[PDB]
Amino acid sequence: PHSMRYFETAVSRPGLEEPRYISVGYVDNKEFVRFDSDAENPRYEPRAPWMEQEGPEYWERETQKAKGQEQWFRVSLRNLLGYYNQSAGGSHTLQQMSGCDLGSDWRLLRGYLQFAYEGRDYIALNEDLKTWTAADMAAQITRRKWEQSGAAEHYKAYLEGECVEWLHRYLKNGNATLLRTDSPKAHVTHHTLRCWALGFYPADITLTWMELVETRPAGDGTFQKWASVVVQNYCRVYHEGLPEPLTLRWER
């Protein structure tokens, strides 16, 4: 159960400014690298400590790709303004998601290549990695252009090849960090019964007693969540961090 993603954004800027392009890589849902065109010297930067292991040629090579992508998004943004009849007086947003899912044996399960314009689906590569799904009539222009030039083949090679091979390397190199868990600490409060799970990592969790908040970052790399009810006839905490599930109720 492993994955890698690159989350890329270009946000245009009205006036003589060019767009701001940002790229973020994730390994098992955790940020590991970041590029930002607004930085003092734009370069890919390590964001997980197991990445400081990669030598200068790795960063030099990744940074070349980011610079390329920045130019690719500029041209694609200009094209999108034309397809949708928009003004460069406004800001516009182009996003990409790409990468791969692996099994517990480290084989490829699925590749992903998806674009959004203005925060909505524009075009995506289907799971077959051969055909495209377009979201609207404008995106069908892109789909026909890309079918005509066999664009999918280049993505399929990346997703089945380099995406997989480099994820193995990061999975190997980050093994001790990635295998780490932080167990929740839990407690119950009275108002409504509220069971809190605190300080846990990763963010997947089950609380059962019914209101339930969105899981939220504590800001130290851990997460929090809570669950509540109507009313000691009554909470269970499920987390891969735990020796076993926690079991509790109100304590006075």
Partner: peptide, 9 residues
């Protein structure tokens, strides 16, 4: 390891 995109939108 990131990717280079091919054809533009």
């Amino acid at each position: 390891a990131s990717l280079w995109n091919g054809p533009h939108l």
